[PDB]
Structures are given as C-alpha cells and as structure tokens.
Amino acid sequence: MIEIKDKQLTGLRFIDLFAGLGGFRLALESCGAECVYSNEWDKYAQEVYEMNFGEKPEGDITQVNEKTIPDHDILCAGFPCQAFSISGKQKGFEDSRGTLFFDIARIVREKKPKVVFMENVKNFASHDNGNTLEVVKNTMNELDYSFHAKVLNALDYGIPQKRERIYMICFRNDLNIQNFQFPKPFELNTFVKDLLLPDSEVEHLVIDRKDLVMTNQEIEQTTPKTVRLGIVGKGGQGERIYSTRGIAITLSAYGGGIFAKTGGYLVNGKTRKLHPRECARVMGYPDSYKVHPSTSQAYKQFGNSVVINVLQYIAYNIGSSLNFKPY
DNA sequence: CCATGCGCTGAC
DNA sequence: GTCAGGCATGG
Ligand SMILES: Nc1ncnc2c1ncn2[C@@H]1O[C@H](CSCC[C@H](N)C(=O)O)[C@@H](O)[C@H]1O
C-alpha cells in the first residue's frame, strides 16, 4: 500500500460487506474514514479479520433485517464472482451464489447512503450479451443514483500483477456530482524478483519434476508483462512456468495443478511456487498484516481479495468530488 | 478437512 | 494459429 498525506474522507462513515481479509477497510481508513459495521459468513475469514481489527463480523447477509444496520455515508462491496468467471459455468443469476447483488439493492433502498462502491471480474461487463450489466445500471437509476463503470489492470498502477477487474461507482442524485474520474495509468518500476523472500526461507517449496520442458530462453531485461519459459505435464492451469523478470499471473481461490493457486517461477536455477507472504506483497498488503496459521486458508483468502493500491487511488477520487462545493 | 489433473471459454 | 483464466474426484 501507499502513504496518503491529504485525508480526503475524514469525517465519513462506511460499512464493510463481503469482508474477507478487509482490503476495503485498510484503503478507506488510510484516507481518514471510520468503519461502523462489517459482515462475512466464512469461519476462517472471521478469524483473520478479528486478529487484525479486534472484532468478529456478523453472519449470513440473507437473514439480516436491513433495518438493524447503522446509518452510514458509503457502502462497500466486492461480491462473489464464481458464477461470472470465464473459468466456470457462467450460470449468472441462475446460480445459488449469483443473486447477492439483490441483497445489496434491498439494503440501499432502506439506508439510502451517499455512495455505493462495488467490484467484480472483467467478464461481468460482457456476460449474457451485455444484459447482466444493463440490469445493474437500471436497478441503480431506479433507486435515484448515477452509474459509472470501468475495467482497470493492476500493472498500470504500480503493482507487478496482471489482474483485470471491473469497478462500479454510484452517487445519489440530490448531490449533483458532475466531475468524477477514474485515475490515470503510470509507468511500472517494480517486478516479481524485487518482492521475493531469501532462499533459506523457502527451500520447502521447490519442485523437481522430470517431465519439465523448457520452451523459451530466460530474459536479461525486465518488462511489464507475463513471460512463459516452460511447461510440465500437458501445460494446463497450474502447470505453467514464468520468469521473475516480468509480472505475476492472476492469483486464484479454487484452482488446481501441481503449482496450485500461485503458478510456478524460475529462481536461481530451480522451479518453485510462491509463499503466503510473497502472496500478500503481490496484492499490496504491508508486512505488518498477520496471515492465517493455516497455509491452505491463507492461499484461498488472498485469491478472493482486492489489490489495495488500486482502491486507494479510486477512494481519493471519490472524496475529491464530494469536497468540491462552490458558491 | 487437503491435493491435483483437467478441459473448456474468451479474446485474440 | 497463440495464450491466459473454476470443477470434479481422490483420499
Ligand atoms: N451469504 C453471505 N453472507 C456473508 N458473506 C458471504 C455470503 N456469501 C459469500 N460471502 C463471502 O463473500 C466474500 C467474497 S470475496 C471478497 C473479498 C474481500 N473483498 C477482501 O477484501 O478480501 C467471500 O469471503 C465469501 O465468504
């Protein structure tokens, strides 16, 4: 994460829905805002959260009486994506995990906050001939809010990882906000090799498979892109090897393969996966954040998460707009 | 609860 | 042609 000097959101309140590790809380707090309510139903996600923030989130949002929820100015939500991803079955609104958006709509109807801030995968903007996106837009306009949306890549915002996601921002109509803008990209200067831990700490993660087929030559000059150098088995998900002189592939939550969830990399002459701390760094978390004692739950948590840096820039732009009020 | 080999989709 | 992005079943 980055350091923020000018605290644009001081004085405001927000809620943390579909919480996870709490990536949305770290970003809004750095800008000055206060959290007054959080929700998340996973047993192990509730444990890490409490370890880092000192409070246990409330359970299953579908059984909560929205009238029970505190007053607030901004609603934060990074809802489930398994039903919308190109790696799954694209069932969408017909999937048991695909109707969470309607619970959000229901809460907004009662609480009517100033801003609603959501996040999902890239394919959300295309799914079902574009019907899925128009439905989200229409619901929001019907509730008296404006609708801004765009797809952004983490490699353009200072983090060495190829992660393309859609971001959706909505302002209440009586506020007449006419000057909101997504942030502008900038040159990358950090690569995978610059975030690695020492060899004496990851010996246990090295893999030696005899069906390895090196297909490309290592590069000596860094680049802002993924550079494949070889393969194992048939070369499907989790069986591909990359150079640390480029950028990292997308981290995942339910993925398989011998190099599961992180992918494989070439370090000092051998092939290995990434460690939980190296995972925290490619998502922008600081070294002071405590990871879960179970290595398996830690990999899954980081794979479902958000890149903090991209959220800090966007949150600052929301505040700049709310603060411009001339006579 | 944890490990791993797919086997297809989308955007080129 | 090329390559990046959860499900099913084993135990
Ligand atoms: N019905 C429900 N009630 C509460 N939490 C739910 C839920 N259905 C799914 N979830 C939670 O929604 C989360 C979506 S992934 C979100 C990660 C979070 N933005 C982060 O900053 O790390 C998962 O952790 C999942 O356990």
A15 CA from C10 C1′ (Å): 41
Does A252 contact strand C, using a CB cutoff of 7 Å? yes
Residue A24 alpha carbon, nearest atom of ligand 1: 21
Q: How far apart are CA A325 and CA A327, in angstroms?
A: 7
Q: How far apart are CA A128 and CA A60, in angstroms?
A: 28
Q: In Å, how far from its chain's centre is CA A162?
A: 12
Strand C: positions under 7 A of a protein C-beta atom: 3-8
H helices within chain A, ranges in order? 23-30, 43-53, 101-111, 131-142, 276-282, 295-304, 308-323
Q: How far apart are CA A246 and CA A242, in angstroms?
A: 8
A102 CA from C7 C1′ (Å): 26
Query: Which value in Å is the resolution of this experimental model?
Result: 2.4
Give the technique used to solve this structure. X-ray
Q: Is the Cβ–Cβ distance between A309 and A152 less than 8 Å?
A: no
- Both tokens of A235, joined, read 């070369």
Mutate to test the pocket of ligand 1, among A38, A40, A51 (most ligand atoms within 8 A of CB): A40
Set out the domains of chain A in order of their start, with CATH numbers: 1-186+285-327 (3.40.50.150), 187-284 (3.90.120.10)
Distance of CA A80 from the midpoint of ligand 1 (Å): 6
Residues of A 275-314 whose CB lies less than 7 Å from any atom of strand C: 303-304
Nearest to A103 by CA among A43, A44, A39: A39
